[PDB]
Amino acid sequence: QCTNVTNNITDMRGELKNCSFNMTTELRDKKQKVYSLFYRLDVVQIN
Amino acid sequence: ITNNAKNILVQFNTPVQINCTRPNNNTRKSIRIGPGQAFYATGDIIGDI
Amino acid sequence: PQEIHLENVTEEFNMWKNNMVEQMHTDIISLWDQSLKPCVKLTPLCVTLQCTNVTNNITDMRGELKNCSFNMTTELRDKKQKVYSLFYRLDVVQINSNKEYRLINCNTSAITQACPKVSFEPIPIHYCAPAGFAILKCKDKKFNGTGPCPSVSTVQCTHGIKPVVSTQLLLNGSLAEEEVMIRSENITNNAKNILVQFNTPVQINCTRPNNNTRKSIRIGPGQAFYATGDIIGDIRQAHCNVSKATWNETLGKVVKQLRKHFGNNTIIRFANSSGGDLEVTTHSFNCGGEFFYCNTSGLFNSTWISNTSNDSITLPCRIKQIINMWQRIGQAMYAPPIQGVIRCVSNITGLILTRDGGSTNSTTETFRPGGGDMRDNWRSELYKYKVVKIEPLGVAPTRAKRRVVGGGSAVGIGAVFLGFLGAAGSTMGAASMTLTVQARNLLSGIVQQQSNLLRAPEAQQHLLKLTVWGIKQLQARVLAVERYLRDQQLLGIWGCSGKLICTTNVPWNSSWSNRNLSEIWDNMTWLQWDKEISNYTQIIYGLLEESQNQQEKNEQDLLALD
Amino acid sequence: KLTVWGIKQLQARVLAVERYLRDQQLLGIWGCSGKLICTTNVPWNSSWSNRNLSEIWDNMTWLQWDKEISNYTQIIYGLLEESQNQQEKNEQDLLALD
Amino acid sequence: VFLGFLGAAGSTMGAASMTLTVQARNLLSGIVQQQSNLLRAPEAQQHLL
Amino acid sequence: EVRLVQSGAEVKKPGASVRVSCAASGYTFTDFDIHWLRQAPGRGLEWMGWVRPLGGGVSYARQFQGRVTMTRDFYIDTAFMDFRNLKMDDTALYFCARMGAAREWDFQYWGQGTRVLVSSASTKGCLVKDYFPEPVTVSWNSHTFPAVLQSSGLYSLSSVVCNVNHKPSNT
Amino acid sequence: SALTQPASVSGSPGQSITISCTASSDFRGFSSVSWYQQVPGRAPKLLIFSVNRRPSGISHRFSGSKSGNTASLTISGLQIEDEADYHCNAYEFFGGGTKVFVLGQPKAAPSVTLFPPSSEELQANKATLVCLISDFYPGAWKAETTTPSKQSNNKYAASSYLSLTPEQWKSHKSYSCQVTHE
Ligand SMILES: *[C@@H]1O[C@H](CO)[C@@H](O[C@@H]2O[C@H](CO)[C@@H](O[C@@H]3O[C@H](CO[C@H]4O[C@H](CO[C@H]5O[C@H](CO)[C@@H](O)[C@H](O)[C@@H]5O)[C@@H](O)[C@H](O)[C@@H]4O)[C@@H](O)[C@H](O[C@H]4O[C@H](CO)[C@@H](O)[C@H](O)[C@@H]4O[C@H]4O[C@H](CO)[C@@H](O)[C@H](O)[C@@H]4O[C@H]4O[C@H](CO)[C@@H](O)[C@H](O)[C@@H]4O)[C@@H]3O)[C@H](O)[C@H]2NC(C)=O)[C@H](O)[C@H]1NC(C)=O
Ligand SMILES: *[C@@H]1O[C@H](CO)[C@@H](O[C@@H]2O[C@H](CO)[C@@H](O[C@@H]3O[C@H](CO[C@H]4O[C@H](CO)[C@@H](O)[C@H](O)[C@@H]4O)[C@@H](O)[C@H](O[C@H]4O[C@H](CO)[C@@H](O)[C@H](O)[C@@H]4O)[C@@H]3O)[C@H](O)[C@H]2NC(C)=O)[C@H](O)[C@H]1NC(C)=O
Ligand SMILES: *[C@@H]1O[C@H](CO)[C@@H](O[C@@H]2O[C@H](CO)[C@@H](O[C@@H]3O[C@H](CO[C@H]4O[C@H](CO)[C@@H](O)[C@H](O)[C@@H]4O)[C@@H](O)[C@H](O[C@H]4O[C@H](CO)[C@@H](O)[C@H](O)[C@@H]4O)[C@@H]3O)[C@H](O)[C@H]2NC(C)=O)[C@H](O)[C@H]1NC(C)=O
Ligand SMILES: *[C@@H]1O[C@H](CO)[C@@H](O[C@@H]2O[C@H](CO)[C@@H](O[C@@H]3O[C@H](CO)[C@@H](O)[C@H](O)[C@@H]3O)[C@H](O)[C@H]2NC(C)=O)[C@H](O)[C@H]1NC(C)=O
Ligand SMILES: *[C@@H]1O[C@H](CO)[C@@H](O[C@@H]2O[C@H](CO)[C@@H](O[C@@H]3O[C@H](CO)[C@@H](O)[C@H](O)[C@@H]3O)[C@H](O)[C@H]2NC(C)=O)[C@H](O)[C@H]1NC(C)=O
Ligand SMILES: *[C@@H]1O[C@H](CO)[C@@H](O[C@@H]2O[C@H](CO)[C@@H](O)[C@H](O)[C@H]2NC(C)=O)[C@H](O)[C@H]1NC(C)=O
Ligand SMILES: *[C@@H]1O[C@H](CO)[C@@H](O[C@@H]2O[C@H](CO)[C@@H](O)[C@H](O)[C@H]2NC(C)=O)[C@H](O)[C@H]1NC(C)=O
Ligand SMILES: *[C@@H]1O[C@H](CO)[C@@H](O[C@@H]2O[C@H](CO)[C@@H](O)[C@H](O)[C@H]2NC(C)=O)[C@H](O)[C@H]1NC(C)=O
Ligand SMILES: *[C@@H]1O[C@H](CO)[C@@H](O)[C@H](O)[C@H]1NC(C)=O
Ligand SMILES: *[C@@H]1O[C@H](CO)[C@@H](O)[C@H](O)[C@H]1NC(C)=O
Ligand SMILES: *[C@@H]1O[C@H](CO)[C@@H](O)[C@H](O)[C@H]1NC(C)=O
Ligand SMILES: *[C@@H]1O[C@H](CO)[C@@H](O)[C@H](O)[C@H]1NC(C)=O
Ligand SMILES: *[C@@H]1O[C@H](CO)[C@@H](O)[C@H](O)[C@H]1NC(C)=O
Ligand SMILES: *[C@@H]1O[C@H](CO)[C@@H](O)[C@H](O)[C@H]1NC(C)=O
Ligand SMILES: *[C@@H]1O[C@H](CO)[C@@H](O)[C@H](O)[C@H]1NC(C)=O
Ligand SMILES: *[C@@H]1O[C@H](CO)[C@@H](O)[C@H](O)[C@H]1NC(C)=O
Ligand SMILES: *[C@@H]1O[C@H](CO)[C@@H](O)[C@H](O)[C@H]1NC(C)=O
Ligand SMILES: *[C@@H]1O[C@H](CO)[C@@H](O)[C@H](O)[C@H]1NC(C)=O
Ligand SMILES: *[C@@H]1O[C@H](CO)[C@@H](O)[C@H](O)[C@H]1NC(C)=O
Ligand SMILES: *[C@@H]1O[C@H](CO)[C@@H](O)[C@H](O)[C@H]1NC(C)=O
Ligand SMILES: *[C@@H]1O[C@H](CO)[C@@H](O)[C@H](O)[C@H]1NC(C)=O
Ligand SMILES: *[C@@H]1O[C@H](CO)[C@@H](O)[C@H](O)[C@H]1NC(C)=O
């Protein structure tokens, strides 16, 4: 679930995204919601 | 040289210097995702995009 | 096994730089990973545990044991199961009347369970050298760590060493002879450890009185995890019992020898472990499949100065199931439980001590036992060995000359042969009398089908493939061929192809040595001879290779040329 | 790489070299280095076989010959390796020794 | 005037036949400066490998 | 590119049991033992203890038995030294060093050092205002002389060529 | 200090001077020595790890040899960069340090600047006479000691203070200070 990185759009058409995902952790039953950054070329849209 | 399918390899006698940069000051964030396993993700970007 | 005693040979070796210890070390470490790789992995066991202390009357009994129920997977993916188990205190940590507990390695390293079938029992293994190499064995009873060994023999493979991982006390090791040895790289330097070897074995009895049980709960298809079940009988501590009369008597042998280095009348105290991980601090050893950890404070509290009940000593020993042998990072092993009561009885043959140091000198000396590294467990047995490669091309001057270019018998009962390399301490003339002895052994088995004859049985290495020793053998048999064919190729250019002794026409320069033929051949060993000519041995090999034998070819056929 | 036959080939080519160089090394001590047939001075004991030269070479295959001498083949290889060719070396150079 | 290894490949058959130990040295083992077999002697290079 | 990084300067009243960190970088930390050395202003270097990374083995000096304890952590390539029950005599600079590759008692790499002073003084503490502890920040309009140690322990100085900022006051 | 070191050494630039390292009569296995060049108040610098071997970053002018129970260090082509604190260690034992002195360097007159007590100073019933001794070389209340410190112009600067009474400062018409150098 990505949100475009903080930028002033003058076109800046940033490829960078800011995506939070439900990631696993050290324990099997537990999970965690962590975020990251990914360029436009690494991610595709899922309808 | 007459056949276009073969590529044309060139060799220079004088080197052409090239300067490349990634001006974005990214940061590394290691979030443990498994026992003994760690995934490295990009963090907050400091400075101008 | 064929062991050869060399006469008049004084070859010394350095125990601390000995390369044989590191090869075994990397050998055991590689061997462990090759056994745990095929076993099942407990990746799903890193789950929040809910533990309740095991049924016990608290008088303080401060039981380390826990009883933890966890939601474990099963054969089917959608289904789960709530199963319980038992874990010692050292295996679980608290994650912020049952509370949440977490396995110790989950935050640092993955874990994998040792196969139940493999046995951790040490068996003797001998290390031999490849064809074209030799191992020299010191037979000096009073042999110091580093220095000359007056009586040296040679052997193909060393007597097998039982690889026993022991932190504070060496176990089931080779006994010393007469007085106990105090081998150290530098007794004055405290950083180096002090290795000891006993002459009289000290028996030790260790047990785990808790009658545990094994519970196999299937956790994956074809995968089964083994957990501890209900404990039958009284909750007791694991203890080791050592007789005090014998330990007091042996300890009196070690303290007597130590005074030779530090003086006749000085305070020689023994102390406890001064710190470190649970490994170094306690006598970490394996027995029956589990891993004890014994506080040895009762063994090492004493004070000796100058001169002048019959009950055993008991040691409280902890037990842990999740361990990282050799302080490796990113790896961990879970030893499966051992059903029933187990007993251990071993022999104590050596200790690993340490100098205390400090600013004060000649006032008091205390020795603290420690187990910093596992390599010192191998130096305690590979001390009497050294690896050498034999070189069979020795040149020397003689008045004999090449058969002119224009020109073109005892049947046995040779006396007192010395065996392989037996003439290494005899004179150059006497040593030159036996040349087929070495030439037999340069290639193939030195004795009794030593190597090549052995690799003939089928499915030994095929099944082995590249696992472990399989790649060790190919590198040992290929290097043997490459060294043999190197000398033959050296002869092929030098002439003398089929001759053990050949004389070819080359002048011996007087600057290489000023000694006469008599003194050289009357009382010199080939070993001493190779030292003086070592500076010029390469040049001799260049003049003799072409000028001696290729000028002949260019002239020999010109002579018959049309 | 090491998959399948790859390790089968290395064990088959290394064992081939080790058996060839074993016979050449046996010759190197026995003399006869470049010779397919060499005769060296060693007495043939009559206890190894009581058959005459004719009957042995007239109608016998080398296979049947290796069977009878199999009991003594190791000893022959010990007398011929040093007494036959190393006594020569110790005497051959003494002969030219100063 | 020796030509080194394979140096007589462009010279006459008579001149090339004058140097035969040059090649025979190099057919096996290191051609020069401990080229191969002399090198594989250091320990744990290939064992670890 | 091998260098040891120590902790910062700290001040503590007797009995405070300070711990110091020594960061290792540029080499395989788990090989060489780490040594703690302390030097007084009017004394020579003094050896306190050595602790090796694999197994934590540590040997402590006779006079520091029961007073000091050293450990380490492989994941952070750092060795720690716990010095409990500190005394007025034990105030000096603390160095952590590594033995050279020659394996003899020689030190090829060191650290910048940490300043540990033990005294009894209030933490709160042109002409100077009583600014204890010693560090001050003099500036003209947004030649400086060293400070003097009085019997009370307060530090006084002078600056001639203000509003000097005080860390205890946080102006 | 199980061993001992010379208190002070002195020599002209370019002259070779030796340093010693004592040994006790109860020393055992004295077979190795390493010398260090410690900048006063900074991290030591290893000059020679072994008795004679020298690291790469150390100059060839530093040398060392051992004769019996005494270790000797000799410096050739002395420069001022070399001036620092030196220590010889045997195993864990160290020494008290060897002071170094380079001769010679021209002296300098102290730029003494004494300032009267401030207005706010005497208001708090506390008198403080401040005397600053700067730009003087070498580093050495009628009618509070501060050691001199180095400066960027290769000179030393110190100071001196005095806790006085305003009633005592107003009873006497004036005060002065004497700074005698060499
Ligand atoms: C065409 O050819 C061109 C010319 O060759 C190529 O250009 C080269 O490109 C490479 C990268 O691909 C560059 O390498 C990197 O240079 C970085 C800058 O270098 C500085 O430091 C140099 C050396 O300084 C050390 O040694 C000197 C003495 O020699 C000493 O004084 C100093 O104190 C220090 O000890 C210096 O020579 C330079 O001038 C610069 O000052 C350098 O930082 C890089 O090191 C990184 O990255 C490499 C590669 O990834 C790692 O192997 C290093 O360990 C280090 O990685 C860091 O981050 C890691 C993340 O994984 C950590 O794991 C590492 O531990 C490490 O963290 C550091 O900090 C820690 C904290 O203290 C330390 O503990 C660690 O030790 C680390 O220091 C790398 O060397 C070349 O420099 C550049 N060439 C030139 C001439 O500049 C061009 O790429 C070619 N074309 C193509 C297409 O490839
Ligand atoms: C062999 O090795 C052992 C272990 O290293 C050495 O013994 C240590 O010895 C001390 C006594 O000398 C033990 O004492 C423990 O003291 C703890 C804290 O008190 C210390 O500090 C206070 C002030 O804070 C002092 O007043 C006090 O005297 C101590 O100096 C206690 O917390 C300990 O209790 C612990 O165990 C109980 C259960 O038994 C727990 O419930 C408690 O929570 C706590 O865990 C204890 O009283 C200490 O145990 C020993 N361990 C340490 C830390 O080293 C031996 O001296 C050494 N040599 C020999 C010959 O045995
Ligand atoms: C306790 O620990 C100390 C070191 O911490 C050990 O001392 C080492 O002891 C060994 C064995 O004696 C020494 O090895 C020898 O070093 C010599 C060089 O140093 C000395 O000799 C030269 C003159 O020759 C002097 O100028 C110099 O000041 C030293 O006095 C070598 O010359 C020796 O032989 C070498 O050179 C010859 C040259 O022909 C070669 O043929 C040899 O193969 C070899 O290369 C030899 O190497 C060693 O130097 C000592 N110091 C160190 C730092 O290692 C103690 O042995 C140890 N144990 C105790 C006290 O029990
Ligand atoms: C990270 O994982 C958490 C769950 O662990 C996600 O929260 C859940 O988000 C879903 C929607 O994707 C919620 O579903 C809701 O269901 C109701 C019907 O029951 C529907 O009417 C809503 O419109 C919605 O679909 C769910 O309630 C919610 N919370 C839970 C399960 O506790 C979270 O969105 C994930 N974040 C990601 C993927 O970035
Ligand atoms: C083994 O797994 C089962 C589930 O398969 C666990 O049962 C569940 O335990 C959790 C608490 O850890 C219960 O959560 C409850 O949620 C309500 C709010 O919805 C909250 O108010 C309660 O205080 C509590 O947190 C859950 O209801 C319960 N049952 C389910 C999911 O069916 C069981 O605890 C696990 N046992 C272990 C981990 O030892
Ligand atoms: C360890 O246990 C063994 C037995 O398992 C003890 O050996 C006994 O020794 C006594 C004499 O001391 C003999 O009378 C017994 O017959 C021996 N047992 C057997 C089975 O032969 C050994 O003494 C014990 N040692 C310690 C230190 O506890
Ligand atoms: C090692 O074992 C010894 C006993 O042999 C322990 O000594 C005791 O620990 C208790 C705490 O439960 C203290 O009250 C005692 O005072 C300690 N003994 C002595 C003589 O002081 C020692 O603590 C143990 N150490 C470790 C690390 O296990
Ligand atoms: C080592 O043994 C000695 C005894 O030789 C132990 O000394 C005990 O000291 C306490 C007082 O602190 C006395 O009350 C005990 O009676 C002494 N023991 C005996 C048997 O009389 C000493 O504590 C022991 N140390 C360790 C670490 O085990
Ligand atoms: C942001 O971008 C818009 C593009 O029209 C530009 O007009 C505006 O001035 C920019 N402002 C900032 C703060 O970057
Ligand atoms: C050589 O060894 C023999 C014993 O095998 C001995 O009798 C003889 O004296 C020794 N000679 C020399 C020079 O060592
Ligand atoms: C249990 O331990 C307590 C400790 O005070 C003791 O008093 C009690 O007698 C013990 N009882 C049993 C049944 O073990
Ligand atoms: C929690 O504690 C109770 C009482 O000791 C026990 O019966 C239960 O099995 C424990 N574990 C759970 C509920 O997961
Ligand atoms: C037994 O140990 C004690 C010290 O604990 C010692 O005094 C005594 O001499 C030892 N026994 C013998 C026979 O040496
Ligand atoms: C015992 O000490 C005496 C006096 O110091 C000394 O003469 C003697 O050699 C020593 N004997 C032993 C066996 O250490
Ligand atoms: C011996 O040969 C060397 C070259 O190998 C030569 O330099 C020398 O002059 C020759 N003669 C003597 C007497 O050394
Ligand atoms: C040379 O040999 C003779 C006879 O053995 C001997 O007397 C003479 O000392 C020897 N001289 C040298 C230099 O070897
Ligand atoms: C070698 O031994 C002979 C006696 O066989 C003796 O005369 C000669 O001096 C010895 N030379 C050396 C170096 O030992
Ligand atoms: C070997 O040659 C070196 C010089 O390269 C010389 O210093 C040394 O003494 C010689 N040693 C012998 C045994 O000839
Ligand atoms: C033949 O040689 C053997 C030993 O190999 C000997 O025992 C026998 O007496 C010899 N002669 C005869 C006639 O067998
Ligand atoms: C030996 O050879 C002769 C001639 O061939 C033959 O007649 C005789 O029977 C043979 N005897 C034995 C014992 O081989
Ligand atoms: C071998 O063949 C010959 C004929 O060539 C015959 O005379 C002789 O009897 C045969 N001997 C045996 C054992 O077959
Ligand atoms: C081989 O020798 C054995 C005795 O070791 C003897 O029984 C057998 O008959 C012999 N066979 C031959 C063919 O010589």
Residue numbers in the entry:
A (entry chain G): 130 to 140, 150 to 185
B (entry chain G): 277 to 309, 312 to 321, 321A, 322 to 326
C (entry chain G): 81 to 140, 150 to 185, 187 to 309, 312 to 321, 321A, 322 to 399, 410 to 509, 511 to 664
D (entry chain G): 567 to 664
E (entry chain G): 518 to 566
F (entry chain D): 1 to 52, 52A, 53 to 82, 82A, 82B, 82C, 83 to 100, 100A, ...
G (entry chain E): 2 to 9, 11 to 27, 27A, 27B, 28 to 91, 96 to 106, 106A, 107 to 143, ...
Give sentences from the paper:
The HIV envelope (Env) glycoprotein trimer mediates viral entry into target host cells and is the only virally encoded surface antigen accessible to the humoral immune system on intact virions. Thus, native flexibly linked (NFL) HIV Env trimers were designed to circumvent the requirement for cleavage by substituting the REKR cleavage site at the C-terminus of gp120 with a longer 2xG4S peptide that covalently links gp120 to gp4120. The CD4bs is a difficult epitope to access as it is surrounded by a glycan fence (including N276 in the CD4bs Ab footprint area) that has to be bypassed or accommodated by an incoming antibody. All VRC01-class HIV antibodies isolated to date against the CD4bs from HIV-naïve31 as well as infected persons are kappa chain antibodies, except for the sub-group of PGV19, PGV19b, PGV20, and PGV20b, which are lambda chain antibodies (all isolated from the same donor).
Here we present the crystal structure of BG505 NFL.664 in complex with bNAbs PGV19 (CD4bs) and PGT122 (N332 supersite) at 3.39 Å resolution. The asymmetric unit contains one copy each of the BG505 NFL.664 protomer and Fabs PGT122 and PGV19 with 75.2% solvent. The trimer complex was refined to Rcryst/ Rfree of 31.1%/ 32.6% and consists of Env residues 32gp120 to 664gp41 with 3 out of the 10-residue 2xG4S linker being resolved; residues 149–150 and 186A-H in the V1–V2 loop (HXB2 numbering) are disordered. The BG505 NFL.664 clade A Env adopts a native-like, compact, prefusion conformation. The PGT122 Fab binds vertically, crowning the trimer at the N332 supersite, while CD4bs Fab PGV19 binds laterally and more centrally around the trimer axis. The prefusion conformation of gp41 is preserved in the presence of the covalent flexible 2xG4S linker and deletion of the natural REKR cleavage site. We observe for the first time the entire FP of the BG505 isolate in the absence of interacting bnAbs, such as VRC34.0140, ACS20241, or PGT15137. Clear electron density for 23 out of the 27 potential glycosylation sites (~85%) on the BG505 soluble Env protomer was observed (2Fo−Fc at 0.8–1.0σ) in the BG505 NFL.664 crystal structure. The NFL crystal structure illustrates the extensive glycan shield and interactions of PGV19 with the surrounding glycan fence with N363 on top, N234 and N276 below, and N197 from the same protomer, as well as Man9 modeled at N301, and N295 from the adjacent protomer.
